[PDB]
Design an enzyme around this catalytic site. Structure first.
Site, mmCIF file in Angstrom:
data_model
loop_
_atom_site.group_PDB
_atom_site.id
_atom_site.type_symbol
_atom_site.label_atom_id
_atom_site.label_comp_id
_atom_site.label_asym_id
_atom_site.label_seq_id
_atom_site.Cartn_x
_atom_site.Cartn_y
_atom_site.Cartn_z
ATOM 1 N N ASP A 34 30.686 56.628 -7.167
ATOM 2 C CA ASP A 34 29.281 56.773 -6.812
ATOM 3 C C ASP A 34 28.893 56.022 -5.540
ATOM 4 O O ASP A 34 27.763 56.188 -5.067
ATOM 5 C CB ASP A 34 28.337 56.463 -7.993
ATOM 6 N N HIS A 57 27.635 50.459 -8.809
ATOM 7 C CA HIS A 57 26.823 49.624 -9.686
ATOM 8 C C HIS A 57 27.616 48.422 -10.180
ATOM 9 O O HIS A 57 28.831 48.482 -10.348
ATOM 10 C CB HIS A 57 26.353 50.424 -10.902
ATOM 11 N N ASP A 75 32.917 50.863 -8.406
ATOM 12 C CA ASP A 75 31.716 51.633 -8.692
ATOM 13 C C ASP A 75 30.547 50.977 -7.961
ATOM 14 O O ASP A 75 30.521 49.753 -7.783
ATOM 15 C CB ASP A 75 31.529 51.621 -10.210
ATOM 16 N N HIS A 128 29.182 49.366 -17.956
ATOM 17 C CA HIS A 128 27.882 48.821 -18.337
ATOM 18 C C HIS A 128 27.788 48.459 -19.812
ATOM 19 O O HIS A 128 26.789 47.837 -20.223
ATOM 20 C CB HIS A 128 26.777 49.827 -18.037
HETATM 21 C C1 LIG Z 1 17.069 59.105 -13.959
HETATM 22 C C2 LIG Z 1 17.720 57.760 -14.272
HETATM 23 S S1 LIG Z 1 19.162 57.541 -13.199
HETATM 24 O O1 LIG Z 1 20.116 58.627 -13.405
HETATM 25 O O2 LIG Z 1 18.787 57.672 -11.794
HETATM 26 N N1 LIG Z 1 19.873 56.037 -13.486
HETATM 27 C C3 LIG Z 1 20.707 55.924 -14.683
HETATM 28 C C4 LIG Z 1 22.138 55.551 -14.301
HETATM 29 C C5 LIG Z 1 22.832 54.593 -15.024
HETATM 30 C C6 LIG Z 1 24.136 54.269 -14.666
HETATM 31 C C7 LIG Z 1 24.743 54.906 -13.586
HETATM 32 C C8 LIG Z 1 26.162 54.536 -13.145
HETATM 33 O O3 LIG Z 1 26.793 55.218 -12.437
HETATM 34 N N2 LIG Z 1 26.721 53.248 -13.508
HETATM 35 O O4 LIG Z 1 28.006 52.818 -13.115
HETATM 36 C C9 LIG Z 1 24.033 55.849 -12.868
HETATM 37 C C10 LIG Z 1 22.743 56.182 -13.226
HETATM 38 C C11 LIG Z 1 19.272 54.852 -12.878
HETATM 39 C C12 LIG Z 1 19.722 54.677 -11.424
HETATM 40 C C13 LIG Z 1 18.834 54.926 -10.385
HETATM 41 C C14 LIG Z 1 19.293 54.763 -9.084
HETATM 42 C C15 LIG Z 1 20.603 54.365 -8.863
HETATM 43 N N3 LIG Z 1 21.406 54.144 -9.880
HETATM 44 C C16 LIG Z 1 21.019 54.277 -11.135
HETATM 45 ZN ZN LIG Z 2 27.950 53.621 -11.206
#
Ligand SMILES: CCS(=O)(=O)N(Cc1ccc(C(=O)NO)cc1)Cc1cccnc1
Ligand SMILES: [Zn+2]
Ligand SMILES: [K+]
Length: 357
Positions: free
Chosen positions: A264, A173, A171, A133
């Site tokens: 994830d 995301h 990943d 990110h």
């Molecule tokens: C309380 C805020 S959060 O923790 O839920 N979040 C922050 C976050 C940022 C990056 C990663 C990651 O893994 N990037 O590759 C994961 C979480 C947002 C979120 C919510 C639901 C699903 N995904 C993300």
């Molecule tokens: Zn992720």
């Protein structure tokens, strides 16, 4: 064939001093490492040391301003670090965060160097904080510097500038930073599979849609496979690899494969909502090993269920070591929205990749 492994417990020092239960835990990497030892995989690998990335190396992808700000955090007090982290989307910072980010990148440079000189055939990097990110000029989503993007540029710097690097980002995301860094680049092919939900899933941008194919000379070299309306798992990921990832990758003919290997999307993750199994990740790893004469570096990104990530990443290393893939469960019919996604990517990219026609 020799498999390298990098792990350094110093990367545990980056921590959230206000919320000790924040999911991006120091123990993410120690737990993965432990599972490798428990399964007797560690002793079968050749240990590669961590090192600090230099500021010149960070400048391969990041602005001088961004480097200087994260560097300055090393000298701040808790109250000031809380405020500074809050300036970003989803970032916590401690006084060791900068150094840990440097170690994550330098670990991957050492691993890529070992692969590109033949010291090892492939390698796994058990590193944190994650990278995908992180943008040229900012931190985001637990990531300070874009380790995978920097590793691609470092690899080019020790071979030739046009060395073809494939980044597969599994990943859950979208790796927004990686996409943006290479958006106008045809030497680095970026392929991401990610939960999208029509732009409602983090990081909440339509940049992650299938129609973003790259810009300029990079048109065709950015492949987004976005998932909507379903708890995707092994069937959907195997189908995406068979119809999209592997045909495109083979046509690109990479000389190095980097995996932005977040875990994830795994069954059990508290955030991803998906159900990719450890055996699924093993199968994805095994397929990527057929590219670039086996020159594959697996880089830890996200993944927040300690058991899930430990089993999943260990199964990937087992594949790198040459073990036979574990058996997948019976693959249910693909969720209908997953077929729609695959068709949309196929039609967006068939103009650029004749293997998709
Ligand atoms: C309380 C805020 S959060 O923790 O839920 N979040 C922050 C976050 C940022 C990056 C990663 C990651 O893994 N990037 O590759 C994961 C979480 C947002 C979120 C919510 C639901 C699903 N995904 C993300
Ligand atoms: Zn992720
Ligand atoms: K690209």
């Amino acid at each position: 064939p020799i498999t390298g492994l990098v792990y350094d417990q110093r990367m545990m020092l980056h921590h959230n001093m206000w919320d000790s239960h924040h999911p991006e835990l120091p123990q993410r990497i120690s737990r993965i490492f432990s599972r490798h030892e428990e399964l007797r995989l560690l002793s079968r690998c050749h240990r590669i040391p961590a090192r600090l990335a230099t500021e010149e190396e960070l400048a391969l992808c990041h602005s001088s301003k961004h480097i200087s700000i994260i560097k300055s955090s090393e000298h701040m007090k808790p109250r000031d670090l809380n405020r500074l982290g809050d300036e970003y989307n989803s970032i916590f910072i401690s006084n060791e965060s900068y150094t840990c980010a440097l170690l994550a990148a330098g670990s991957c440079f050492n691993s890529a160097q070992a692969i590109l000189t033949g010291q090892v055939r492939n390698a796994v990097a058990i590193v944190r904080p994650p990278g995908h990110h992180a943008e040229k000029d900012t931190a985001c989503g637990f990531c300070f510097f874009n380790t995978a993007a920097l590793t691609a540029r470092y690899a080019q710097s020790i071979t030739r500038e046009s060395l073809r690097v494939l980044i597969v980002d599994w990943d859950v995301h979208h790796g927004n930073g990686t996409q943006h860094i290479f958006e106008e680049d045809d030497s680095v092919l970026y392929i991401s599979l990610h939960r999208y939900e029509d732009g409602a899933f983090f990081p909440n941008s339509e940049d992650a849609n299938y129609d973003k194919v790259g810009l300029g000379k990079g048109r065709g070299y950015n492949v987004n496979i976005p998932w909507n309306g379903g708890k995707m798992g092994d069937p959907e990921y195997m189908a995406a690899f068979h119809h999209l990832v592997m045909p495109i990758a083979r046509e690109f003919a990479p000389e190095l494969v980097l995996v932005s290997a977040g875990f994830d999307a795994a069954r059990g993750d508290p955030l991803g909502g998906f159900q990719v199994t450890p055996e699924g990740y093993a199968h994805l790893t095994h397929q990527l090993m057929s590219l670039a004469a086996g020159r594959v570096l697996i880089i830890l990104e996200g993944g927040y269920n300690l058991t899930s990530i430990s089993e999943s990443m260990s199964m990937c290393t087992s594949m790198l070591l040459g073990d036979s893939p574990p058996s997948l469960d019976h693959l249910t019919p693909l969720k209908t929205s997953a077929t729609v996604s695959i068709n949309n990517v196929l039609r967006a990219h068939a103009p650029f990749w004749s293997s998709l026609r």
